[PDB]
Structure 1
Amino acid sequence: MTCTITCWGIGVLLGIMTTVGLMVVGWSFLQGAFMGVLAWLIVGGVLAVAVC
């Protein structure tokens, strides 16, 4: 691997960014975290599949 795990790491890092980014513009932690979790699975999953 060493690339699928790395791409997964970018996804979880983006989810943390998405959570705090949405909290800055309002929203709430749980509302922001849900989109952060959702962004982790989609973007992280796509990156691991689009490029290996």
Structure 2
Amino acid sequence: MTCTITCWGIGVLLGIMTTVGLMVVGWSFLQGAFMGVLAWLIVGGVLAVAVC
């Protein structure tokens, strides 16, 4: 691999960034985490397929 894991690692980092970003602008930790989980699955999944 060495690229799918990196893309997966990029997605989870973006998910954490989107998690704290929503908390700063309001929202809640649980609501922000779900979007972070969603961002990790979507962006990480898209990257794992779009770029290899």
The TM-score normalised by the length of structure 1 is: 0.98
2:26 corresponds to: 26
CA distance in 1, matches of 2:15, 2:24: 14
The RMSD of aligned alpha carbons is 0.3
Structure 1 residues without counterparts, runs of 5 or longer: none
Structure 2 residues without counterparts, runs of 5 or longer: none
- Across the two proteins, how many residue pairs are aligned to each other? 52
User: How high is the sequence identity, in percent, across the aligned residues?
Assistant: 100
Deviation at 1:19, TM superposition (A): 0.3
Deviation at 1:39, TM superposition (A): 0.4
Deviation at 1:25, TM superposition (A): 0.1
Deviation at 1:23, TM superposition (A): 0.2
CA distance in 2, matches of 1:6, 1:39: 15
The TM-score normalised by the length of structure 2 is: 0.98
Moved over 2 A (4+): none
CA distance in 1, matches of 2:42, 2:18: 13
